[PDB]
From a paper:
The NS3 protein plays an essential role in viral polypeptide processing and genomic replication, with a protease domain at its N-terminus and a helicase domain at the C-terminus. Given its essential role in genome replication, ZIKV helicase could be an attractive target for drug development against ZIKV. To elucidate the molecular mechanisms of ZIKV helicase in recognizing ATP/Mn2+ and RNA, we determined the crystal structures of ZIKV helicase180–617 complexed with ATP/Mn2+ and ZIKV helicase172–617 complexed with a 7-mer RNA (5′-AGAUCAA-3′) at 2.2 Å and 1.7 Å, respectively.
Fortunately, we captured the ZIKV helicase180–617 in an ATP-bound state, which is the first structure of any flavivirus helicase bound to ATP, even though it displays NTPase activity. The overall structure of the ZIKV helicase180–617 in complex with ATP/Mn2+ is similar to that of its apo-form (overall RMSD 0.557 Å), except for the movement of the P-loop (residues 193–203) towards the inner core and lateral movement of main-chain residues 411–416 to better accommodate ATP. In the ZIKV helicase180–617-ATP-Mn2+ tertiary structure, ATP/Mn2+ are located at the cleft between Domain I and II. Substrate binding causes an inward reorientation of side-chain of K200 to stabilize the triphosphate moiety of ATP and a flipping of the side-chain of R202 towards the solvent to leave room for sugar moiety. The Mn2+ ion is coordinated in an octahedral geometry by side chains of E286 (motif II) and T201, two ordered water molecules and two oxygen atoms from the β/γ phosphate groups of the ATP molecule, which stabilize the nucleoside triphosphate. The ribose group of ATP bulges out from the binding pocket and no clear electron densities are observed for the adenine group, suggesting that the ZIKV helicase may not have nucleotide specificity for its NTPase activity.
Numbering used by the authors: 182 to 246, 254 to 617
Write the structure that this text describes.
């Protein structure tokens, strides 16, 4: 149709308008009719699976871990394939759903895609109700939403918030961190509620439980802003988030809790008011928003990824321009030689290390299986487990205090992350 190359379109209908399950299949059917080599990009594998069914019997290859011109994969999968030697089709049409996702792989993907549009080699469609720079925390909905500013608990409580537990419906509660969510969920559970906790690490297995089991509360991080569907009538929003910040170019901290963006607030609010024959959904929020970023590490990490993706001779892809000033970096300053790039990739995939940390280790000429850097840092880089120095048994047979040469707070911000990094340090993966 007008997928006739040459162009980037931002489909920005209000939340719940039918972008993912009404408009998306229409575009795919058009793309197949016009025989365009197309890729579909979902934010998560959970959402990718729900797209399988909305794309009823259409020739779509699902690269989710014949005459097949149309691919479906998640944001991170797409970006991950671009970094590897493994061949990626120069698609004629790029479709990114939930294109507001601010994770490094999603930022990198938007940059790569938009760059391909500018070069005149492809068309692109970014689907999101909240494009970069939106200041509207209260967009349109299918049904009226009762918006109420309240004092939202960020700690366990024994009194003062009756309205929280005095609610017979189902509530989605956005928290700024996993650990904060743990405390709130434990309080709700003790008060007799059934609670499901969602985070980025647990999402792909815990989200499916929000359907096939009963629940009163979902306590979730900002991961549920990316196309997550709940049968709920209430959203409690702390309006808080944590921001990864690179300090003095030498370490990453998790600053906050801190005001979420208008986009995030709109996406959080947008979890309800979706049912057209159902008014009464409430959005209860505990504070204001802010354009917080620009020292947000994710956009620098996105640059690290994009610098190591090849398009054609000497060419480095630009960030999607509405996002391009979110970071102070020179394009190509993180480009690694091919051997270092390989280590960089493995550290992110098999190593499951944050992009920033993986770059530090790889650019220092360290091989993937060399874990000495996990112990030879300054003593202020010491990682604590419950107010006591965390220790692992090394591959060489010593009990060493975990003390990484480069400190990234994301490797120990909760128990699951610490367990994973402790295992990485012991050379177990
Ligand atoms: N298979 C389906 N087809 C069409 N509509 C559906 C389907 N399943 C659920 N719906 C409902 O129809 C509405 C359309 O939802 P959809 O996810 O397409 O909106 P959206 O524009 O993607 O929202 P957002 O921008 O917040 O992701 C929702 O309120 C949803 O609850
Ligand atoms: Mn959607």
């Amino acid at each position: 149709s007008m997928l006739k190359k040459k162009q980037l379109t931002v489909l920005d209908l209000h939340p719940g308008a039918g972008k993912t399950r009404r408009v998306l299949p229409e575009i795919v059917r058009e793309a197949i009719k016009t025989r365009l080599r197309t890729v579909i990009l979902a934010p998560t594998r959970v959402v990718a699976a729900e797209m399988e069914e909305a794309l009823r019997g259409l020739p779509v290859r699902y690269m989710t871990t014949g005459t097949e011109i149309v691919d479906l994969m998640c944001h991170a999968t797409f970006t991950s394939r671009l970094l590897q030697p493994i061949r990626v089709p120069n698609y004629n049409l790029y479709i990114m759903d939930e294109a507001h996702f601010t994770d490094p792989s999603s930022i990198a993907a938007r940059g790569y895609i938009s760059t391909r549009v500018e070069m005149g080699e492809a068309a692109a469609i970014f689907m999101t109700a909240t494009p970069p720079g939106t200041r509207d925390a209260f967009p349109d909905s299918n049904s009226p939403i009762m918006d109420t500013e309240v004092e939202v608990p960020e700690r366990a409580w024994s009194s003062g918030f009756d309205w929280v537990t005095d609610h017979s419906g189902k509530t989605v509660w956005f928290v700024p961190s996993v650990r904060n969510g743990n405390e709130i969920a434990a309080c709700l559970t003790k008060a007799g509620k059934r609670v499901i906790q969602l985070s980025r690490k647990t999402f792909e297995t815990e989200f499916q439980k929000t359907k096939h089991q009963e629940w009163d509360f979902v306590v979730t991080t900002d991961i549920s802003e990316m196309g997550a569907n709940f049968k709920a009538d209430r959203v409690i929003d702390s309006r808080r988030c944590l921001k990864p910040v690179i300090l003095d170019g030498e370490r990453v901290i998790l600053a906050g809790p801190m005001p979420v963006t208008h986009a995030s607030a709109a996406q959080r609010r947008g979890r309800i008011g979706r049912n057209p024959n159902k008014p009464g959904d409430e959005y209860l929020y505990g504070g204001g928003c802010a354009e917080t970023d620009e020292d947000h590490a994710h956009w620098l990490e996105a640059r690290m990824l994009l610098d190591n993706i090849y398009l054609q001779d000497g060419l480095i892809a630009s960030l999607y321009r509405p996002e391009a000033d979110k970071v102070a970096a020179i394009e190509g300053e993180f480009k690694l030689r091919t051997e270092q790039r390989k280590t960089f990739v493995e550290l992110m995939k098999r190593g499951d290390l944050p992009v920033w940390l993986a770059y530090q280790v790889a650019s220092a000429g360290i091989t993937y299986t060399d874990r000495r850097w996990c112990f030879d840092g300054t003593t202020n880089n010491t990682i604590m487990e419950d107010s006591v120095p965390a220790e692992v048994w090394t591959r060489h047979g010593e009990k060493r205090v975990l003390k990484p040469r480069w400190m990234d707070a994301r490797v120990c911000s909760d128990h699951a992350a610490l367990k994973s990094f402790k295992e990485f340090a012991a050379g177990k993966r």
